[PDB]
Ligand SMILES: COc1ccc([C@H]2C[C@H]3c4c(nc5ccc(Br)cc5c4N2)CCN3C(C)=O)cc1Cl
Ligand SMILES: [Mg+2]
């Protein structure tokens with residue numbers, strides 16, 4: 001309750017001051033409270049506080065509870081990863097022109113899902129996992145003092161909840177592989193149409209996965225430090241080769257396809273390539 005005090009009072013700087021619009025954004029320099037201000041700003045400049053009548057102290061308390069339910073002792077799957085998946089989500093919506101293709105509940109749900117998609121992650125040394133993630137997301141969203149969706153109507157609330165659930169489950173890399181063939185097939189032959197409700201949900205699943213792994217598209221010194229955070233989880237509880245395989249099989253074709261839909265999502269495709277080149281050179285010693 002001490003943390004709520006200093007955050008609920010502080011003035012939330014502009015999105016441009018916080019740089020959360022760059023695809024090339026990083027969070028190392030930021031304290032925990034600074035990531036909270038950036039989170040409020042994301043909600044704010046996505047017109048979410050406006051359209052859904054969010055009270056400032058509920059959002060502050062909701063963010064701090066989401067942060068609380070990540071585990072600082074887990075190397076990579078922590079609030080910083082949740083914060084970053086939400087930031088790239090923001091950068092994709094604004095800097096990537098993607099905002100206009102989605103309804104407000106779709107954007108309000110994508111952002112809530114991005115922030116919550118890994119809640120209570122113990123580390124990979126322990127879609128089962130993602131159902132627990134959504135349950136955590138649901139508990140806090142209904143915890144008293146945190147109900148940021150209270151301004152929503154009943155069928156507004158029902159819709160947002162369903163989209164939140166789909167998106168947290170979408171972060172399952174298994175479901176990504178199952179459904180990405182249809183997304184790639186559709187973009188392959190000018191057949192992609194968002195007005196089809198099915199193609200829209202499929203796209204939301206792809207967009208979540210694109211932000212979930214967006215650390216691979218970062219500037220090399222940041223992506224290298226994140227890849228270090230990843231290794232600390234994996235064995236501390238070779239690397240350049242596994243990185244190229246991960247990029248080859250998982251990341252590249254997705255960011256390729258997202259670049260087709262939004263040519264301003266290209267920094268993610270480009271940054272992923274620049275990291276593949278660096279990882280490929282290293283893999284050869
Ligand atoms: C030696 O230690 C590693 C092992 C494997 C890897 C590969 C693959 C890896 C993996 C996963 N997420 C990532 C997110 C961001 C970045 Br940046 C790299 C990632 C990543 N890279 C999940 C899938 N996954 C698996 C199952 O192994 C990197 C490292 Cl350091
Ligand atoms: Mg997960």
Ligand SMILES: [Zn+2]
Pocket residue numbers: 081085117118171212
């Ligand atoms: Zn994740």
